[PDB]
Scaffold this motif. Structure first.
Motif, short mmCIF file in Angstrom:
data_model
loop_
_atom_site.label_atom_id
_atom_site.label_comp_id
_atom_site.label_asym_id
_atom_site.label_seq_id
_atom_site.Cartn_x
_atom_site.Cartn_y
_atom_site.Cartn_z
N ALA A 4 -5.79 -11.93 -10.76
CA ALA A 4 -6.71 -12.52 -9.79
C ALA A 4 -7.91 -11.60 -9.61
O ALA A 4 -7.96 -10.49 -10.15
CB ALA A 4 -6.06 -12.79 -8.43
N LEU A 5 -8.87 -12.07 -8.82
CA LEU A 5 -10.12 -11.39 -8.53
C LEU A 5 -9.94 -10.36 -7.42
O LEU A 5 -9.02 -10.47 -6.61
CB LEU A 5 -11.18 -12.41 -8.14
CG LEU A 5 -12.06 -12.99 -9.24
CD1 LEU A 5 -11.30 -13.92 -10.17
CD2 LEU A 5 -13.22 -13.74 -8.60
N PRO A 6 -10.82 -9.35 -7.36
CA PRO A 6 -10.74 -8.40 -6.24
C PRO A 6 -11.17 -8.97 -4.91
O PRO A 6 -10.81 -8.40 -3.87
CB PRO A 6 -11.67 -7.26 -6.68
CG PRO A 6 -12.60 -7.89 -7.64
CD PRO A 6 -11.79 -8.91 -8.37
N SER A 7 -11.93 -10.07 -4.89
CA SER A 7 -12.29 -10.70 -3.63
C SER A 7 -11.09 -11.38 -2.99
O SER A 7 -10.85 -11.24 -1.78
CB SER A 7 -13.42 -11.71 -3.85
OG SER A 7 -14.61 -11.07 -4.29
N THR A 8 -10.31 -12.11 -3.78
CA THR A 8 -9.05 -12.71 -3.33
C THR A 8 -7.95 -12.25 -4.26
O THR A 8 -7.69 -12.88 -5.30
CB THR A 8 -9.15 -14.23 -3.28
OG1 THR A 8 -10.26 -14.62 -2.46
CG2 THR A 8 -7.88 -14.83 -2.67
N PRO A 9 -7.29 -11.13 -3.96
CA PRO A 9 -6.08 -10.77 -4.70
C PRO A 9 -4.83 -11.46 -4.19
O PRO A 9 -3.75 -11.26 -4.76
CB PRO A 9 -5.98 -9.25 -4.49
CG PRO A 9 -7.34 -8.83 -4.01
CD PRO A 9 -7.81 -9.99 -3.20
N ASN A 10 -4.94 -12.24 -3.12
CA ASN A 10 -3.78 -12.93 -2.57
C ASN A 10 -3.35 -14.09 -3.47
O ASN A 10 -2.15 -14.30 -3.67
CB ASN A 10 -4.08 -13.42 -1.16
CG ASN A 10 -4.35 -12.28 -0.20
OD1 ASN A 10 -5.46 -12.15 0.32
ND2 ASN A 10 -3.34 -11.46 0.05
N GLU A 11 -4.30 -14.83 -4.01
CA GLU A 11 -3.99 -16.03 -4.77
C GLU A 11 -4.47 -15.88 -6.21
O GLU A 11 -5.60 -15.42 -6.44
CB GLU A 11 -4.64 -17.26 -4.14
CG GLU A 11 -4.09 -17.60 -2.76
CD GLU A 11 -2.65 -18.03 -2.80
OE1 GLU A 11 -2.23 -18.66 -3.80
OE2 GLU A 11 -1.92 -17.76 -1.82
N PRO A 12 -3.65 -16.25 -7.20
CA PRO A 12 -4.00 -15.97 -8.60
C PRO A 12 -5.01 -16.97 -9.15
O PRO A 12 -4.85 -18.18 -9.02
CB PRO A 12 -2.65 -16.09 -9.32
CG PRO A 12 -1.87 -17.01 -8.48
CD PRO A 12 -2.29 -16.77 -7.06
N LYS A 13 -6.06 -16.43 -9.76
CA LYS A 13 -7.11 -17.20 -10.43
C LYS A 13 -6.85 -17.33 -11.92
O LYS A 13 -6.62 -18.44 -12.43
CB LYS A 13 -8.46 -16.52 -10.20
CG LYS A 13 -9.66 -17.14 -10.91
CD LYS A 13 -10.13 -18.42 -10.24
CE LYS A 13 -11.44 -18.89 -10.86
NZ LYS A 13 -11.20 -19.38 -12.23
N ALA A 14 -6.84 -16.21 -12.63
CA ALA A 14 -6.72 -16.17 -14.08
C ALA A 14 -5.32 -15.71 -14.45
O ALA A 14 -4.77 -14.81 -13.82
CB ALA A 14 -7.75 -15.21 -14.68
N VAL A 15 -4.73 -16.34 -15.47
CA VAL A 15 -3.45 -15.92 -16.00
C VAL A 15 -3.55 -15.81 -17.51
O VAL A 15 -4.56 -16.18 -18.12
CB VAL A 15 -2.30 -16.86 -15.60
CG1 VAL A 15 -2.11 -16.86 -14.12
CG2 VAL A 15 -2.56 -18.25 -16.09
N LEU A 16 -2.48 -15.32 -18.12
CA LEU A 16 -2.47 -14.93 -19.53
C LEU A 16 -1.02 -14.81 -19.96
O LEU A 16 -0.10 -15.15 -19.21
CB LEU A 16 -3.29 -13.64 -19.73
CG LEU A 16 -2.82 -12.25 -19.30
CD1 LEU A 16 -3.76 -11.20 -19.85
CD2 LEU A 16 -2.74 -12.08 -17.79
N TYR A 17 -0.79 -14.36 -21.20
CA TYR A 17 0.55 -14.37 -21.78
C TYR A 17 0.81 -13.04 -22.48
O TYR A 17 0.04 -12.09 -22.36
CB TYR A 17 0.71 -15.56 -22.73
CG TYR A 17 0.68 -16.88 -22.02
CD1 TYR A 17 1.82 -17.42 -21.46
CD2 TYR A 17 -0.51 -17.58 -21.89
CE1 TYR A 17 1.78 -18.64 -20.80
CE2 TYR A 17 -0.56 -18.78 -21.23
CZ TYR A 17 0.59 -19.30 -20.69
OH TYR A 17 0.53 -20.51 -20.04
#
Lengths: 49, 48
Positions: A4-17
């Motif tokens: 996730a972003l440093p502005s909102t680390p509470n909720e995940p934005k980007a994921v990967l494998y």
């Protein structure tokens, strides 16, 4: 794996494998390897190659 | 394109050092070369 972003680390934005991909290269003679001592595939220099 | 750590007024920038340590500087005539750059695409260095 979940980022996730440093502005909102509470909720995940980007994921990967993650992958056990048997990476080979039948056609590269691999000019410019930078200096690594003996270790794994990890240096800021070894990322170029 | 060239990066070195220390710079003094006697010879500008260094280009290396010997084993028994002393700053081996650059000649005013043929150094630094116009072609010496970076072999890494990253690491645009600055502030140190």
């Amino acid at each position: 794996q979940f980022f996730a972003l440093p502005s909102t680390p509470n909720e995940p934005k980007a994921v990967l494998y993650a992958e056990n991909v048997s990476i080979e290269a039948p056609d590269t003679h691999l000019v410019y390897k930078p200096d690594v001592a003996q270790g794994t595939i990890s240096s800021a220099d070894l990322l170029t190659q | 394109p060239f990066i070195g750590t220390n710079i003094n007024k006697d010879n500008g920038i260094q280009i290396g050092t010997d084993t028994t340590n002393q700053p081996i500087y650059a000649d005013k005539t043929y150094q630094p070369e116009p072609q010496v750059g970076q072999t890494q695409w990253n690491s645009e260095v600055g502030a140190a």
